[PDB]
Design a protein around this motif. Structure first.
Motif, PDB file in Angstrom:
ATOM      1  N   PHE I  13       6.099 -36.237  95.133  1.00 32.44           N
ATOM      2  CA  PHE I  13       5.710 -36.824  93.865  1.00 32.44           C
ATOM      3  C   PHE I  13       4.253 -36.497  93.595  1.00 32.44           C
ATOM      4  O   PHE I  13       3.487 -36.188  94.510  1.00 32.44           O
ATOM      5  N   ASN I  14       3.882 -36.578  92.324  1.00 32.97           N
ATOM      6  CA  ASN I  14       2.527 -36.282  91.897  1.00 32.97           C
ATOM      7  C   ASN I  14       1.591 -37.457  92.113  1.00 32.97           C
ATOM      8  O   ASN I  14       2.001 -38.615  92.214  1.00 32.97           O
ATOM      9  N   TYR I  15       0.308 -37.131  92.169  1.00 31.49           N
ATOM     10  CA  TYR I  15      -0.757 -38.081  91.926  1.00 31.49           C
ATOM     11  C   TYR I  15      -1.785 -37.462  90.993  1.00 31.49           C
ATOM     12  O   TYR I  15      -2.997 -37.614  91.163  1.00 31.49           O
ATOM     13  N   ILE I  16      -1.286 -36.743  89.988  1.00 28.32           N
ATOM     14  CA  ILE I  16      -2.116 -36.090  88.986  1.00 28.32           C
ATOM     15  C   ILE I  16      -2.483 -37.101  87.912  1.00 28.32           C
ATOM     16  O   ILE I  16      -1.678 -37.967  87.548  1.00 28.32           O
ATOM     17  N   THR I  17      -3.704 -36.987  87.397  1.00 25.78           N
ATOM     18  CA  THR I  17      -4.111 -37.641  86.161  1.00 25.78           C
ATOM     19  C   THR I  17      -4.077 -36.659  84.999  1.00 25.78           C
ATOM     20  O   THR I  17      -3.330 -36.839  84.035  1.00 25.78           O
ATOM     21  N   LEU I  20      -7.779 -31.341  84.196  1.00 24.45           N
ATOM     22  CA  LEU I  20      -9.164 -30.949  83.988  1.00 24.45           C
ATOM     23  C   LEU I  20      -9.866 -30.703  85.311  1.00 24.45           C
ATOM     24  O   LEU I  20     -10.699 -29.797  85.420  1.00 24.45           O
ATOM     25  N   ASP I  21      -9.544 -31.493  86.330  1.00 21.60           N
ATOM     26  CA  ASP I  21     -10.077 -31.233  87.659  1.00 21.60           C
ATOM     27  C   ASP I  21      -9.609 -29.898  88.221  1.00 21.60           C
ATOM     28  O   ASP I  21     -10.264 -29.356  89.119  1.00 21.60           O
ATOM     29  N   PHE I  28      -4.447 -24.202  89.160  1.00 22.91           N
ATOM     30  CA  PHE I  28      -3.315 -24.855  88.524  1.00 22.91           C
ATOM     31  C   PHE I  28      -2.200 -24.930  89.548  1.00 22.91           C
ATOM     32  O   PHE I  28      -2.345 -24.419  90.662  1.00 22.91           O
TER      33      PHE I  28
END
Ligand code: MG
Ligand code: ZN
Lengths: 126, 158, 38, 237, 143, 64, 96, 176, 55
Positions: I13-17, I20-21, I28
RNA sequence: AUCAUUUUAAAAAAGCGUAAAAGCUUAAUAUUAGAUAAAUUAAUGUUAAAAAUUAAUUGAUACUUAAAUAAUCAUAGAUGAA
């Protein structure tokens, strides 16, 4: 339209939950079904959340421990406090009031030491 | 610090990046060194012709740090080159007069895909369909032409 | 305050409060929006 | 879209089901605009009396009903529930569909003509209908609905079909009558538009035109413009 | 009054001390309409205030329509005479200062052909609040 | 004469049953996906008349 | 510099070629990319000639996710816009 | 349904009791010093967790007073062997105080005396522009803390004057 | 049909916001490398794979 | 003018905001937990199927059309509740 001129500041009353933490350790049984996903969401709020309102040395982890009795949320605070909360029965709301029961006291401990653990007023307006 | 204060779109020539006062209005109050900035730009774009205007973005941060990012040139400017006109229609849809042929679209899409970070996931039909809708807004059409055009250097504001 | 028989909400932040037979509006942003019904 | 592009490329062939399906509905409707569905509808109800006044019913949420009859027939007026009435609208077919009313063992055909609502209060006042009998003329409204045709050459490009009338009033003398009218305008042009007599020539034997309602057969419905560029070039020059 | 010679002749009409009439409303030309819901003396300024706001609806730039949108049938009917200030009664009838329209109960003020349902409901509510009269809006949809 | 039937007609409705009561289908299916590598699809309806047992595309390939 | 597309000074100008030389999917561009709106009228007549390729379905769906948001944002406008102001109209705009 | 939550601290230990008849239900809190009990109607159902020391309530009676019942119950227990706290500040030129044994002396441009005298509180100075109050009841504290505030409060033009350390502050431009 | 036939399941699972980071480091997240069996069938964050390590 | 793509979803944007930029919020949406989806009417006697059922109501919830009923307020004069 019209330009606001009254600036209402709400920065000092901002009280996030994971701010007095130094670390965290998620624990997972693949046999839970209610105690897995609760810990999934917490691990996001530890990293998906913002770093301003956390410490600098905050490191959250996740481990699959088949040997545990139940999936757990171990935590460590600044001034020495340490606990564990199993998750096969609880909710995300019952956990937060425990965190307030610590975070409300650490202020009473650190303010006496002279530390300003508060935020500027200009951080969040209404 | 690493938190993003602001984002700015810009337009620059590849190897003639230079502390123009007409870019310090944006980067001035953020305390960024135009000289130290433009150095790292011209260094990367040495493999690109100097006549061409590109665009760039800058995630200006809270400590007045920066992290520049480069993108292909403006998609409209690239077509004015092929079309050999500078100014396009007031109206759109009603006034359709310009013509390109597909065999250059297939070549200028590769420009976007080879460089732009957003299209790394994308196919070419996808990209080619993006500009056609951009062409509908401009007075442009896609029609077969055997001939080639001759060179033209349409303006850019820089 | 200003007594409007027909009360009215200017901004979204305006809201109604009833203290007995008393009625009024208040805003957390613009303290000039507030009213009373009399 | 809902799946990543990288997986869609593997399954780009799958989307024939999408387009092969839309063949089926839109063609089916386009040819079924004309025909009444063969499905019987019934409305249990009660007679009128001088006792049941309006406002008495309207707290009970019933409704009056009114029927106008035809040659030699008497009028009939009935009572019914509101939710029956709106459900009768809520069909596609409301403009013409034959609805029955069962008081007891009796049944009375009808059609929709219209409804009145109390505008300031916005509750149902009455529901008005028109009798239908088989062996006698009966007013109905045949809407016109124009199909698209990519077979003509002027219709395809820079021209505009103009539907001046939405429907036609007629008199029907038989059980099953056509819901609407459907037209294929290929043979039409700027030079000749369609006229009502071109329809009068093509109808079943049980149907006739209600001349009392229309003006003249030479009246015209579908008109076609000229080209736009031939104007636009002249507009600028 | 007398419609024969309007401008030439001098005109007088009886005030009608209790005049009430109802005329069964029904649409003829178009789809939607506005109708009055009370006997009333309809002025002219009751129209000219919200005259532009109908043009902004029914008419728009660079769009051509062959058929007709609005059908109006309003005409003046009542002279509304009056006396001066310091004048005793008798010695004749008063003089003019205005003109009006005496309308019946169910009167089609306006009849519309394919006009935005969403704006006329926003209009007629504001119309009726300035006037403080009961007015209605009707569409072939709801009927 | 076949107009109405074809509207509601779909062959993919059979999937949830065959996924249960055909071990010949899965066991070789396990091999296609886990071990080796192709753009496998699975049950793919052949113009709403058949459902191919296993297929690969765009090459118009069939493993029945 | 007698360059048509060459951004890179090192590369050369990719020269034109016969249209058959290129992949098929360029052919799907020259045709008029219909809306989903006219596309139904095509299906009303079953014109075998004009019919969408497979990739057209994704773009039609993205007209349709995006048209639903156009109405919800209109209905707010039609009901909350002061009578002084003007609506955008939904008909053609014949100029001249 | 809103399922209200009853916190219990960690120092406290509790028990839950019922009849054989099952028509009565009550609960018992017990500490080294104190002890406290309270019942539950036949229409209030209950859930307990030792994992969190939290208790959950449903109410078939639909009484809206329970939301107040909580805050009393919650704070009345944390009122055992724990304080409540608050902090006060100021910013200005001719301002000061002096502190002598829970007797705070205030000098904020006023002709009259401004003594503050605390009955059964704790007051300990951390800096010239900062002082903490401490007490076991929250309701006496605010009455004790706000009297200090009413002498001078924040000007809406400048943040000069006294204020709490956590508050909504207002600001308005002036003399640009 | 893939979800039933998988053996060594690796739930991720993701923990992306936001990217931009990552964009502002010219990076990417790839999915061509290891085009996986499943991406977001029911839970719109879950991913399943065979690879016990997935970078 | 209202196209197109990447997305699990995201308007050439329904609005605030800017010298222009930036920045903020809704529509559309996800993860987790809690959590509403309940009652019915009319049809071709029995044979299709690794499979598929039409027309239609009432009701719980949200959006939406809106109206009605009930209470409260909607400033008051001059010898004293009046
Ligand atoms: Mg956009
Ligand atoms: Zn306000």
């Amino acid at each position: 339209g019209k330009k606001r001129r009254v600036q209402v500041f709400t920065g000092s009353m901002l009280q996030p939950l994971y701010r007095y933490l130094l670390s965290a350790k998620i624990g997972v049984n693949p046999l839970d079904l209610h105690g897995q996903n609760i810990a999934k969401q917490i691990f996001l709020k530890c990293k998906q959340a913002r770093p301003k309102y956390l410490q600098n040395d905050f490191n959250a982890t996740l481990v699959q421990d088949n040997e545990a009795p139940a999936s757990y949320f171990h935590a460590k605070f600044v001034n020495g406090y340490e606990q564990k909360w199993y998750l096969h029965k609880s909710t995300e709301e019952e956990i937060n009031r425990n965190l307030k029961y610590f975070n409300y006291q650490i202020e009473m401990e650190r303010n006496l030491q002279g530390h300003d653990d508060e935020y500027e007023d200009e951080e969040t307006q209404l | 610090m690493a938190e993003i204060k602001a984002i700015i779109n810009l337009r620059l020539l590849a190897g003639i990046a230079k502390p123009n006062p007409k870019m310090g209005q944006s980067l001035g109050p953020l305390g960024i060194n135009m000289m130290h900035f433009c150095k790292d730009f011209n260094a990367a774009t040495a493999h690109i012709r100097s006549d061409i205007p590109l665009r760039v973005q800058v995630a200006a941060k809270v400590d007045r740090s920066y992290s520049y990012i480069i993108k292909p040139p403006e998609t409209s400017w690239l077509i004015k080159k092929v079309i050999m006109k500078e100014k396009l229609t007031q109206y759109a849809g009603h006034v359709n007069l310009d013509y390109i042929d597909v065999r250059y679209v297939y070549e200028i899409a590769k420009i976007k895909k080879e460089i732009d970070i957003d299209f790394k996931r994308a196919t070419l039909e996808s990209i080619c369909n993006c500009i056609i809708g951009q062409c509908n807004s401009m007075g442009v059409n896609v029609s077969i032409i055997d001939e080639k055009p001759k060179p033209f250097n349409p303006k850019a504001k820089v | 305050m200003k007594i409007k028989s027909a009360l009215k909400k200017y901004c979204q932040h305006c809201y109604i409060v009833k203290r007995g037979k008393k009625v009024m509006i208040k805003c957390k942003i613009d303290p000039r929006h507030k009213q009373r019904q009399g | 879209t809902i799946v990543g592009s990288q997986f869609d490329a593997q399954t780009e062939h799958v989307n024939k089901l999408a387009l092969d399906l839309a063949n089926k509905k839109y063609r089916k409707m386009a040819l079924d605009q004309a025909v009444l569905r063969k499905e019987k509808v019934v409305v249990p109800a009660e007679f009128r009396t001088e006792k049941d006044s309006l406002i008495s019913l309207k707290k009970e949420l019933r409704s009056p009903v009114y029927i106008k009859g035809h040659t030699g027939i008497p009028d009939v007026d009935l009572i019914a529930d509101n939710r029956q009435v709106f459900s009768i609208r809520r069909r596609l077919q409301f403009q013409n569909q034959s609805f029955y009313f069962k008081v007891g063992n009796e049944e009375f055909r009808c059609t929709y003509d219209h409804i009145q609502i109390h505008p300031m209060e916005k509750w149902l006042v009455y529901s008005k209908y028109r009798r239908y009998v088989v062996g006698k003329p009966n007013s109905i409204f045949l809407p016109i609905n124009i199909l698209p045709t990519f077979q003509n050459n002027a219709i395809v490009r820079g021209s505009e079909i103009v539907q001046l009338l939405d429907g036609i009033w007629v008199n029907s003398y038989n059980d099953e009558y056509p819901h609407s009218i459907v037209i294929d305008p290929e043979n039409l042009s700027k030079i000749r538009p369609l006229r009502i007599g071109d329809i009068h020539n093509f109808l079943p034997d049980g149907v006739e035109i209600d001349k009392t309602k229309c003006l003249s057969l030479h009246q015209k419905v579908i008109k076609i413009t000229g080209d736009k560029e031939r104007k636009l070039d002249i507009a600028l020059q | 009054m007398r419609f024969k010679n309007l401008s030439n002749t001098k005109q007088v009409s009886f005030k009608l001390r209790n005049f009430k009439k109802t005329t069964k409303y029904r649409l003829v030309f178009g789809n939607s309409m506005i109708l009055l819901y009370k006997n009333a003396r309809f002025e002219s300024i009751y129209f000219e205030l919200f005259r532009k706001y109908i043009k902004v609806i029914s008419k728009k730039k660079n769009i051509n329509i062959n058929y007709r949108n609005c059908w109006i049938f309003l005409r003046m009917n009542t002279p509304l005479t009056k006396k001066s200030k310091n004048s005793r009664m008798g010695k004749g009838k008063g003089a003019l200062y205005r003109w009006l329209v005496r309308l019946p109960k169910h009167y089609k003020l306006l009849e519309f052909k394919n006009v935005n349902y969403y704006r006329l409901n926003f209009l007629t509510k504001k119309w009726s609040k300035r006037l403080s009269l009961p007015l209605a809006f009707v569409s072939k949809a709801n009927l | 004469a076949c107009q109405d039937a074809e509207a509601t007609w779909d062959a993919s409705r059979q999937i949830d049953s065959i996924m249960e009561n055909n071990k010949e289908w899965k066991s070789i299916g396990v091999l296609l996906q886990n071990r080796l590598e192709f753009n496998s699809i699975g049950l793919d309806n052949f113009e709403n008349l058949l459902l191919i047992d296993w297929a690969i595309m765009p090459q118009r390939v069939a493993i029945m | 510099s007698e360059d048509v597309i060459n951004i890179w000074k090192d590369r050369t100008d990719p020269e034109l070629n016969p249209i058959n030389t290129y992949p098929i999917w360029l052919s799907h561009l020259l045709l008029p990319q219909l809306r989903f709106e006219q596309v139904a009228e095509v299906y009303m007549a079953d014109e075998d000639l004009l019919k969408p390729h497979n990739r057209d379905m994704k773009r039609l769906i993205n007209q349709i996710r995006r048209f639903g948001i156009y109405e919800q944002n209109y209905t707010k406008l039609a009901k909350s816009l002061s009578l002084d102001f003007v609506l955008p109209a939904r008909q053609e705009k014949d100029l001249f | 349904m809103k399922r209200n939550i009853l916190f219990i601290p960690f120092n406290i230990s509790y028990s839950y009791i019922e009849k054989n008849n099952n028509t009565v239900k009550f609960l018992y809190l017990y500490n080294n010093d104190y002890f406290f009990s309270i019942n539950f109607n036949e229409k209030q159902s209950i859930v307990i967790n030792e994992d969190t020391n939290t208790i959950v309530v449903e109410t078939r009676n639909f009484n809206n007073k329970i939301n107040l019942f909580n805050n009393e119950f919650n704070k009345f227990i944390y009122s055992w062997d724990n304080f409540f706290f608050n902090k006060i500040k100021f910013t200005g030129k001719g301002f000061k105080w002096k502190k002598k044994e829970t007797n705070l002396f205030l000098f904020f441009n006023r002709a009259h005396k401004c003594f503050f005298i605390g009955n059964n509180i704790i007051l300990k100075r951390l800096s010239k522009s900062k002082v903490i109050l401490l007490k076991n009841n929250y309701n006496h504290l605010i009455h004790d803390s706000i009297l200090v505030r009413t002498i001078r409060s924040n000007n809406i033009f400048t943040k000069r004057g006294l204020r709490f350390s956590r508050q909504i502050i207002l600001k308005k431009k002036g003399k640009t | 049909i893939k979800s039933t036939l998988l053996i060594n399941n690796n739930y991720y699972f993701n923990y992306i916001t936001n990217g931009l980071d990552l964009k502002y480091d010219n990076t990417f997240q790839n999915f061509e490398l290891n085009t996986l069996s499943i991406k977001n069938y029911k839970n719109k964050n879950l991913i399943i794979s065979n690879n016990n390590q997935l970078d």
